[PDB]
Amino acid sequence: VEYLQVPSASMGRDIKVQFQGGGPHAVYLLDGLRAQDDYNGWDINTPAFEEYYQSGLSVIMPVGGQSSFYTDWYQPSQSNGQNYTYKWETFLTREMPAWLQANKGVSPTGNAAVGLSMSGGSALILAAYYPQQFPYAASLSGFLNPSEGWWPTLIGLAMNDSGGYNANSMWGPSSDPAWKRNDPMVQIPRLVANNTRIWVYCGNGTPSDLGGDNIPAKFLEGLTLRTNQTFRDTYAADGGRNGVFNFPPNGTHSWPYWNEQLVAMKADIQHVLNG
């Protein structure tokens, strides 16, 4: 596994990327809400790299972007002294794939975006707007209707609690178009039109022997399950026909279950991306 420094002109800094080669197409493994600046949470908490070693797929783990939602923000987060504007969608769709193509031979098209929690919706949004780059997208316990109802408030609370980040610096006031633009439920017609292969998982809040037995992990999983079930219904009602929906009667908002899903989807990704 290599630790790379990839310049981001749009953010004015270098972004650390953990990288395992192994094929021209890649799985982009996006982090959760509390992404650290040293290593991606997939590497800290799971054997993701080992599990995809010799899979015929490269594995890309960008590092950093706490509370970023892997999106382009309007402005720096005001409350916590951020001195630049997050531009993580520009980085993921323009800057990083160009760098990996030139230097590693990773194809900028035909890749998979895999997100969990915070980035579950991000992965679907990336596939909705960049279908040539991401014919495959997985959302593990994602928040799939962020513009609806109380979700902007809940997202604002969680972002302020995880590092003091300001959701209004990200997508503006709740009536700003950026909220619906980045709402996977709203963008289901794009996923259908693109025939995106989507893998949508959410547990029910009940731990198994995999662990993750704590109240916040149980609560968050049960909370977002309802949104995920609604997403499944709306996808089918809108003509969606290329989805895998995994809602087993177990699982909390914790890394063992996300790893179990990453392993489970490997053959699916291999078949879609490599044939």
From Swiss-Prot:
Active site: S117, E221, H253
Key words of the record: Acyltransferase, Secreted, Signal, Transferase
Effect of loss of the gene: Cells lacking this gene transfer 40% fewer mycolates to the cell wall with no change in the types of mycolates esterified to arabinogalactan or in the composition of non-covalently linked mycolates. As a consequence, the diffusion of hydrophobic chenodeoxycholate and of hydrophilic glycerol through the cell envelope occurs much more rapidly in mutant cells than in wild-type.
Enzyme type, top EC level: transferase
UniProt superkingdom: Bacteria
Subcellular location: Secreted
Chain positions recorded as substrate binding sites: L33, R34, S117, N145, L223, T224, L225, R226, T230, H253, S254, W255
Entry similarity comment: Belongs to the mycobacterial A85 antigen family.
Misc: Was identified as a high-confidence drug target.
Biological role stated in the UniProt entry: The antigen 85 proteins (FbpA, FbpB, FbpC) are responsible for the high affinity of mycobacteria to fibronectin, a large adhesive glycoprotein, which facilitates the attachment of M.tuberculosis to murine alveolar macrophages (AMs). They also help to maintain the integrity of the cell wall by catalyzing the transfer of mycolic acids to cell wall arabinogalactan and through the synthesis of alpha,alpha-trehalose dimycolate (TDM, cord factor).
UniProt-recorded name of the protein: Diacylglycerol acyltransferase/mycolyltransferase Ag85C
Source organism per UniProt: Mycobacterium tuberculosis (strain ATCC 25618 / H37Rv)
